[PDB]
Amino acid sequence: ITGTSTVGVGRGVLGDQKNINTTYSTYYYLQDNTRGNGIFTYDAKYRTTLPGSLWADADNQFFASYDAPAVDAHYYAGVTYDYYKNVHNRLSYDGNNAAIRSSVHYSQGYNNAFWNGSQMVYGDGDGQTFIPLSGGIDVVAHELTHAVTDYTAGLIYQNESGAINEAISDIFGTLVEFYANKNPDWEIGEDVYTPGISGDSLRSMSDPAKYGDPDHYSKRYTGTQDNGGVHINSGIINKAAYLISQGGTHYGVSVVGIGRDKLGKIFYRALTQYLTPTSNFSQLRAAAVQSATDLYGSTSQEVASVKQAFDAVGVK
């Protein structure tokens, strides 16, 4: 809507106070004008009609329990925006400051969050498996990253190209979590998963096998469920990405780590210049090698490390 930019204050899902960019016109709306063409957060009011209504608040203070998932969806969209702009010179997901829209309170006890082709959608969880999913900065940035993947490489959501699509989202979801630098790790969803169990997550990049996902190509899932294993076989690529950044010896293959920022530059370039809708894992390796070549030279350690990492997870 049309109005004046203001700054509200509230608490997120985990109880943390933060400032949020709002817009005043009779009510205060969750409309951030400071980023691109706007960041907009909506109330789906426990239903599945989207987007629902632009979030409106009488007094610019967002401390009610009902408010917390909106606060975090709105704030973490901003953080994700800032990551892509400041780190990769990318202005929103289309590169031309497309509006970022998110709906919270989607359905009842909905244990998921997704990008629907046009906007973000967040369930509140059932309180046992998940709490409201926008509380997870890695979840927010994972799912927002699909918007850019769909706009750039366009990796189809099935079989190996799908698993790459998923790994890309885990990779940048994690790098945004490190960017924000609040309890960062290489695990996915730890801040919103199983409130009664500490130390767990839904997936691990550092050790995919912790939660039954493959960490080697020879262990890939070959079946038809999960669209040919897109959320399973992502572990193979997540492990490769982890090794490129952190190093290690995996199934006897040693990798020299080159750190998170170079990981991010290599995979961003691969995503936006070399991958295609039907890329497979071998093609991902080639794209990552070419990207690292472009950035650091054919003879660099960075290139050697990318090759070692893919060797380590069995991808030729």
Ligand SMILES: Oc1cccc(Br)c1
């Ligand atoms: O996928 C993207 C890219 C840039 C900004 C945001 Br928010 C999401």
Ligand SMILES: Oc1cccc(Br)c1
């Ligand atoms: O990408 C997502 C969506 C929902 C939960 C988790 Br963990 C990750």
Ligand SMILES: [Ca+2]
């Ligand atoms: Ca209020």
Ligand SMILES: [Ca+2]
């Ligand atoms: Ca964390």
Ligand SMILES: [Ca+2]
């Ligand atoms: Ca995490």
Ligand SMILES: [Ca+2]
């Ligand atoms: Ca937990």
Ligand SMILES: [Zn+2]
């Ligand atoms: Zn995903």
